[PDB]
Design a protein that fits this description.
2 copies of one chain form a homodimer. Chain A has a single domain, classed as D-Maltodextrin-Binding Protein, domain 2. The first copy, chain A, contains 13 helices and 9 strands. In chain A, strands 1, 2, 3, 4, 7, 8 and 9 form a 7-stranded mixed sheet that branches. In chain A, strands 5-6 form a two-stranded parallel ribbon. The longest helix of chain A is centred in the last third of the chain and has 35 residues. It is classed as transport protein. Keywords: trap, substrate binding protein, transporter, transport protein. The assembly is dimeric. The entry is titled "Crystal structure of spin labelled VcSiaP R125A bound to an artificial peptide ligand".
Chain lengths: ~325, ~325
């Protein structure tokens, strides 16, 4: 074909005088996640005067998050994203932070992360898996679209609410009184356009990007899942760094994270107004009957694990 | 499986108040071409102070250069790279600038681009195909590796010189007295390692990235093909822009091109020393017998096309 090196050929080529960091992510070119990673790369090159460089591998081209995190464990990848709650697959008590409605908002989720419990989870990520969590970035709060108005929890009765295969999404739809319809992402839009399904749930950027809004006349601000992305660095990569480079990385990640978090909050405000401007009916149902409907979910969790993890988290 | 928008999903999503430009390229993540494109994106964001933004699509994920150039013609892609000489597929006289040894160095090639001949080609690019060429960036001079020294053109006799299945690389190997072996890029390393082939020819960065050096014992600075990349923007995209944004674009491209050109020159000096340090024997054979050996190719071209294209170009 053409004499052009592939991404695989260049992956392990190091830069001279500079420390080349590779970062993978599932999010695609054009996403806020990818844009913030680009900003992180530019800040690192600036703060380090070219001595730290960042190469980006989006769209899960290196594998999914499970594979990419393994690569950090083994030193084959330097940085990746992973949700705080996603740690639950490896450290079961971490799942508590992604049960529907446990995090009231991102300030609450941030406090969970920075607490002794969060530090406990982060210490175990590092001891077992060589995952050093540098920061948590707000990545959006899920809301509920639908083909009829959602003014109260009473309205979910008889709602066929699309939900992905994930356990907590399913817990949300069922414990709310709706009837969950598990389904792959690529089939949601159509399912809603023909009203083969009644609604779905996702953060506002996903609803905009997938154009779900044009097949849904209503949006309810259910605030049922607050999402984050942690920025994780491989511990083997970290210990190779001078204390100067360590500090540049920590400060660059904090700075980009503040901007990322602020950007997501900004986008959510614009999308609500964009959805209203398109004719969508936006409701703010009382959330307390949703938080009470999740109460059996919570004490179940605290029982099997044997510790009051969820109740601890709700008081933070 | 996951609720994560794809690159396809995000491609046509716009930014509010900002003009989203989309850039495709064959070069992969980690290449100098890709890195300069990220610098162009950062410069546009800063000089437009948020009003112009650039999304990058590397590794030919959008198609090859022929497909990407067509996408500019039709308005589906905004910016891409193409070699000045690559225009010869569409505008036949443009091929003259990539015949072996016509361009003595990049200053010569730049003068070719900026002259009335170059302006004539660039005008035809724009009139027929909606390609506005903004600038030309030096992209490296090809050199010759081998398993025995090349001190003069005489040494090319009986040399198994790998070349890609491309007209002008073939002409180089043939007219130099070597015996060309057309060959796909992916197999080149191995043929060289087992000495199944004697040598190849490529810019120094390709030689390092593919690690041909650990397999070849000699490097001859034959300087036989000076390469560039033009930065082309879709004319339909261009006319949508304000005169203010046009100038930001035009002059951001100049700044990044100066740095790209200087960066490729820096790497070439770097790699010659790296190759020597690895034990490679680096020769500087007299190039005049190579340029004379290309002479029947030149007037052949000037004859078929019917005008002294190559002659005009050599005197520039």
């Amino acid at each position: 074909d053409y004499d052009i090196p592939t991404t695989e050929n260049l992956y392990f080529q190091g830069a001279m005088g500079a420390t080349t960091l590779k970062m993978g992510m599932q999010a695609s070119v054009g996403s806020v996640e990818y844009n913030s990673a680009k900003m992180l790369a530019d800040t690192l090159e600036e703060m380090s005067q070219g001595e730290i460089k960042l190469a980006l591998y989006p769209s899960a081209q290196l594998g999914d998050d499970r594979a990419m995190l393994q690569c950090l464990t083994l030193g084959d990848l330097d940085i990746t994203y992973a949700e705080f709650g996603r740690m639950g697959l490896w450290i079961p008590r971490a799942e508590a932070v992604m049960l529907p409605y446990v995090a009231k908002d991102f300030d609450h989720l941030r406090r969970m992360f920075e607490s002794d419990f969060g530090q406990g989870v982060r210490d175990e990520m590092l001891q077992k898996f060589n995952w050093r969590a540098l920061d948590t970035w707000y990545n959006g709060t899920a809301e509920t679209t639908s083909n009829r108005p959602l003014n109260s929890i009473e309205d979910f009765k008889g709602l066929k609410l699309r939900v992905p295969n994930a356990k907590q999404n399913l817990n949300y739809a069922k414990l709310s009184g709706a009837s969950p319809t598990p389904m792959s992402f690529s089939e949601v839009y159509c399912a809603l356009q023909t009203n083969a399904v009644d609604g779905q749930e996702n953060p506002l950027p996903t609803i905009k990007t997938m154009k779900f809004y044009e097949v849904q006349k209503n949006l309810a601000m259910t605030h049922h899942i607050v999402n984050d992305q942690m920025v994780i660095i491989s511990e083997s990569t970290w210990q190779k760094l001078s204390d100067t480079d360590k500090d540049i990385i920590q400060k660059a990640v904090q700075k980009v994270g503040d901007a990322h978090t602020q950007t997501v909050k900004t986008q959510e405000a614009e999308l609500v107004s964009f959805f209203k401007s398109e004719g969508i009916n936006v409701t703010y149902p009382d959330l307390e009957p949703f938080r009470e409907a999740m109460q059996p979910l919570y004490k179940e969790f605290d029982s099997n694990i044997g510790q009051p993890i969820v109740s601890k988290l709700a008081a933070m």
